[PDB]
Design a protein around this ligand. Sequence first.
Ligand SMILES: [Mg+2]
Ligand SMILES: [Mg+2]
Ligand SMILES: [Mg+2]
Ligand SMILES: [Mg+2]
Ligand SMILES: [Mg+2]
Ligand SMILES: [Mg+2]
Ligand SMILES: [Mg+2]
Lengths: 326, 328, 329, 326
Amino acid sequence: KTVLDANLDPLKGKTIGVIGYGNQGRVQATIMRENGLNVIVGNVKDKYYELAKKEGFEVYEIDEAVRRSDVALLLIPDEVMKEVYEKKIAPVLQGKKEFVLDFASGYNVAFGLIRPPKSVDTIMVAPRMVGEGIMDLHKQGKGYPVLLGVKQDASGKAWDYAKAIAKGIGAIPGGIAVISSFEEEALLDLMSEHTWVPILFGAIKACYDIAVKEYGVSPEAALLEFYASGELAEIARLIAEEGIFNQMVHHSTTSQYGTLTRMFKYYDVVRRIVENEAKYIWDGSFAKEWSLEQQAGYPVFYRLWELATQSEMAKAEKELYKLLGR
Amino acid sequence: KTVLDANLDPLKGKTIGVIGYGNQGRVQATIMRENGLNVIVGNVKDKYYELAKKEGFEVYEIDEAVRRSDVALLLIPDEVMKEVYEKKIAPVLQGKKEFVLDFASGYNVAFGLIRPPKSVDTIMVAPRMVGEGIMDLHKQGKGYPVLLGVKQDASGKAWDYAKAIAKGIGAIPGGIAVISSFEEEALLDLMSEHTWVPILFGAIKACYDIAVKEYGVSPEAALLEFYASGELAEIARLIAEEGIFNQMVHHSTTSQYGTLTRMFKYYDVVRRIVENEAKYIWDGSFAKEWSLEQQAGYPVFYRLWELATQSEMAKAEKELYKLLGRKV
Amino acid sequence: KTVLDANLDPLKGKTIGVIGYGNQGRVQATIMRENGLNVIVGNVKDKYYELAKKEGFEVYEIDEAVRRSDVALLLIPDEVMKEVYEKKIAPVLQGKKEFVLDFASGYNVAFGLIRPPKSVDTIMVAPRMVGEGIMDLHKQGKGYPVLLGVKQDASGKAWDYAKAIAKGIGAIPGGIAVISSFEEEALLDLMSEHTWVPILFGAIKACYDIAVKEYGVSPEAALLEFYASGELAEIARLIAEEGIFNQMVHHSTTSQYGTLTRMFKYYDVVRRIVENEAKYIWDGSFAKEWSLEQQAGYPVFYRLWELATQSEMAKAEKELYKLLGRKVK
Amino acid sequence: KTVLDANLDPLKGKTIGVIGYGNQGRVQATIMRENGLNVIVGNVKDKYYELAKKEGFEVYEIDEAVRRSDVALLLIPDEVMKEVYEKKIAPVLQGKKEFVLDFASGYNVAFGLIRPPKSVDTIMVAPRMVGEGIMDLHKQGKGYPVLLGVKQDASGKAWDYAKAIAKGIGAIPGGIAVISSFEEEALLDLMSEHTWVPILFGAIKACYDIAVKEYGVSPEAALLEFYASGELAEIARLIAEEGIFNQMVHHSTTSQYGTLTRMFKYYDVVRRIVENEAKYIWDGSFAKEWSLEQQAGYPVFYRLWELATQSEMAKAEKELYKLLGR
Ligand SMILES: [Mg+2]
Ligand SMILES: [Mg+2]
Ligand SMILES: [Mg+2]
Ligand SMILES: [Mg+2]
Ligand SMILES: [Mg+2]
Ligand SMILES: [Mg+2]
Ligand SMILES: [Mg+2]
């Protein structure tokens, strides 16, 4: 099912704590205030505390913000969220008889890394839009798409709170709110980061490496074909506006034929990759792998960053981007 | 060897601290007191502290219980034992000149996760019986089987302490005490949890999934065949009383023939699984895997629990157990 | 569907012949009489004839019992049923214009080894409960589960007769009667005997053989871990009472994690075995294999019995069971 | 262990029924009588009844012979023994409180095809010698080898009866009596018939087929190499007299080197065959296969006889043996 509008009433006369004043936090706080909700901000004292104060919000330490709140949006990065939840939020939530904890990312709840108490409505309103894009579309009077989820319905009104927040943050009406789940949103997010993105970058690197090492192509010619021209961004725009296949009518018949035949040829290969990565997300295996990479001090993350940025392709890219003035 | 009785004398006039008043702790404490030994209990103030107080035991914080004790039985879950040992026990043991630390589980000592100091007798008395079963058999005047082990003989009497505790907790006489080790007991415990148990549950799930998806069998018929009837529990009783093969005489010849032929047919397949899991326990690989699952916050444990309890079979089981009026 | 109760009326004023006074026969006869049905017994003159006479039943030769009956329950072992049906029952059934022949086992009808005539309602009421368990639950006023099936609806009332017998034998109400079939019941029974049971015993034997031969474990330690303690029976009870996964909450987290990870790890391997054994049942292949083992004089059955009972594990089990004071062969 | 002599006393003052007056029966009966034992014969009224009568034995129907006997040797072919045991022996044995039933072949008892009652000593005295060979060696005052077994010790003296019969039939002293079993004797007999014998004949046929079809060798040359000369019988004699390897000293060094290297080269291949055939005997699988071949009316036996006797090698053998006058 889909949701095109909602009643804002379950959030009326409630103190709403936006924890974290980053990309998502600033935008979700600002727009909820513009729709006349009582919004405070929780944040450590960074630049982000200052900016929230400067944009007229009551700003507190995270534990205080949660103490004062009936509803909190935990909009901090996933990789620090567990520490902050356990030290500054969970102790306060032992006190509350009723509470609504919202997330924009399913990861930590989906894999059981954060388990709010039985009394807490655990809900998700997860945009598919960067944050600069959300401000832009709100200024134009338009909405954006979100995924909704409820892990734990303590109150019996968790879905109403989720729909309410979706209206509050300016997603609906004008955009859509899709009925989803914490597990589903985490799966979808990670499937992209672990399949089509890395397959795309690998394929582009292999194009460069084969063109240059085996066919005697200049680094600059190879870079200009494989990504360094505008090409990739104007195809990506037509995919979003017209459709992934519909968009192909603007290319030569030679191009259409080559892409269609090779897409069907290699579907089974990329399908096996997608199946294996999806299974490994859904099991919890990826959450264990990444948690243990963090606890080990990021040595694989560190070395793969070095090897990617010191690749023949990355070095040639640096020289070409210098030569073109970027 | 095996041991059928022992001298209780090495425990006489000694304070015996049972750390943890769970399944094993309650029973080992109760029976040691009934055999006239000076038993205190170490435990945080949970429900378990309340029950121990109500059953007439002096109860202390774990560090106090150890300070007051000449002998302690560390009968808490293996998954919290390292933290509790390091924070509440090891500091106290730096003080002691003589001490006996007993375990009912070899795991933490076998994989070096708990290394008591050189002055401490590190011993094991590990039952093969649930705890409800131990109380039942003590009330009937009968013993039960235990595995004995000694990692570290500081005193030169560690084996006497082990045999003594075996008598103390009512294992012997009447039952047996088998000469074993921390490594052997940990290996045996984990071999079951990693081979025949998961193979059994998997085989039962595959029977359900194939019957229902491929042969059009009703969920209810499939559940009633594969486990939801009494069948499994009365075969398990006859295996323990008469023997695993001897027990088969009570089934049809058709059933005997089918089971015998298919057991020999698939032995090599399940043997490969057993070999691989045993090797991976014995190396320490499983201890690293499980320790790292805990430190990562149990995400695989969490998700596999969800996937097992949300399986077609588990959902159908819930509906059928409701319909038959069993707890859900 | 499922059935929780039924009208007993289609069996009222009818003579019901229980053929065979073994585990299932004695119980189904006794309980049908206690519910006020006209029950006679057919049996050869064994100890079982004597016991039926002593428990107050009219007892006859099998052919006589069938001649006198409107309804018969053929509750004899599957491996002798074909001979007895062909010699003592089929000739009598050529005579009858109406008849209800009930089985507690689908095997012989499912694989076409017994094909009653077109005029006979061929029906199945198949318990999932041993027989000592059925008497126990009837004494407590409770029912038990059965599978119902109809191969041949001659009368147009075969399903009513099946539900009726289910009530008659004290399955319902209190228990359930599941709508099933001869083929389905035979498949389900044999799938267990050919997959999870032999896989379990093999896995337990391999645990013993590896622990003892490769890790230097004492026979007695290995036997106490793998089955010779109470362990298996109290897990089997909690599986039936709480559920197969729900039951795991009573074990250590270490135990839960080990079992869950390894169950998912090895599912595909045991699934292949289940697929292969199910296909071989459903084809009739197993019925041919077993029929030919019987006709050959049971030489594989005989030798596999010897090899199982003379295994290192079976010999050690005998010594340990002696030492603990349990029944020893 | 081994047994070189035994006390004949457990058979003294007992009626000994030899059932079957074939190769083994005639010889075991004759020699037991010559050692002063009370020997009667059971047999159907064939030529063999006549011969037993003519050689001075009391001869009866099989059931009568068993009724009159304290000890019987069931020395009839294995492939008829089950029928004869069930119809003419088992009914009589229901009556006996004590009895000793001896076999010269383990097959039927080993695979449970004949199961004498709990009260019967079920024993085996199994020669390794044809029967013409046993008469020959008794006339020379020498013994021969037997395997002893006991399936069922009802009396507690079954082993003494087995050793006694071994002395009775003139095996010991002079020869040996090896402690064995029904299963072991059946296994040993069938291992030969299912491994080295058929491997030998197959290898000889393959030598013929390859020489003739691929190397243009005349059928007569190929037959003269591979078996039709004396070669095979004089090697077989020296193997039995001197030893399987010791015997090789009489051949060229070229021959020794070729045989030693190729024996070690192919050991693993023939070992796999031996393992597979032994396992299939020991399980009871072969007993089921053969019983079902008989019940199906011998169609594989019949067709394989045709294909062996109608092979290019068998036809050429017939022409050559005609030409040499055999
Ligand atoms: Mg994404
Ligand atoms: Mg265990
Ligand atoms: Mg059965
Ligand atoms: Mg069953
Ligand atoms: Mg355990
Ligand atoms: Mg031979
Ligand atoms: Mg030569």
